[PDB]
């Protein structure tokens, strides 16, 4: 399927134990996609002071359309030193590995895979 229904655990930035996916734009996108498939991917909602507490490169989920069955359609955009790889709509948050942190909520998304 080109799209997959996922419920992403929303993590508080200060709870996150693994603060990025890797060391290159291509690796963080690869690792993000693998974790999304394996259900080991969390979401941190971007506010003032969040991003400087996470490791670059960043992987964002961005709204790709205006929401089947409650699931917002999203795609992945990476960012390194202020340059983004991909072009999409509004940021829903920054993806991180999930390694057992307790979530505050769940964000239903339809991921373009």
UniProtKB/Swiss-Prot annotation:
Residues 1-113 are annotated as: Disordered. It is found in: Host cytoplasm. It comes from the Viruses. Residues 2-113 form the CoV Nsp1 globular domain. Inhibits host translation by associating with the open head conformation of the 40S subunit. The C-terminus binds to and obstructs ribosomal mRNA entry tunnel. Thereby inhibits antiviral response triggered by innate immunity or interferons. The nsp1-40S ribosome complex further induces an endonucleolytic cleavage near the 5'UTR of host mRNAs, targeting them for degradation. This inhibits the integrated stress response (ISR) in the infected cell by preventing EIF2S1/eIF2-alpha phosphorylation upstream of stress granule formation and depletes host G3BP1. This is Host translation inhibitor nsp1. The gene is rep. The chain holds residues 11 to 125 of 7096 of the full protein.
């Amino acid at each position: 399927k080109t799209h997959v229904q996922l419920s992403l655990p929303v993590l508080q930035v200060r709870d996150v134990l693994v603060r990025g996916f890797g060391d290159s734009v291509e690796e963080v996108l690869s690792e993000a996609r693998q974790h999304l498939k394996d259900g080991t991917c969390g979401l941190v909602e971007v506010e003032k002071g969040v991003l400087p507490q996470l490791e670059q490169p960043y992987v964002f989920i961005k709204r790709s359309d205006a929401a089947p069955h409650g699931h917002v359609m999203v795609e992945l955009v990476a960012e390194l030193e202020g340059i983004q790889y991909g072009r999409s709509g509004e940021t829903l948050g920054v993806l991180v590995p999930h390694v057992g942190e307790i979530p505050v909520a769940y964000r239903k998304v339809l991921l373009r895979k």
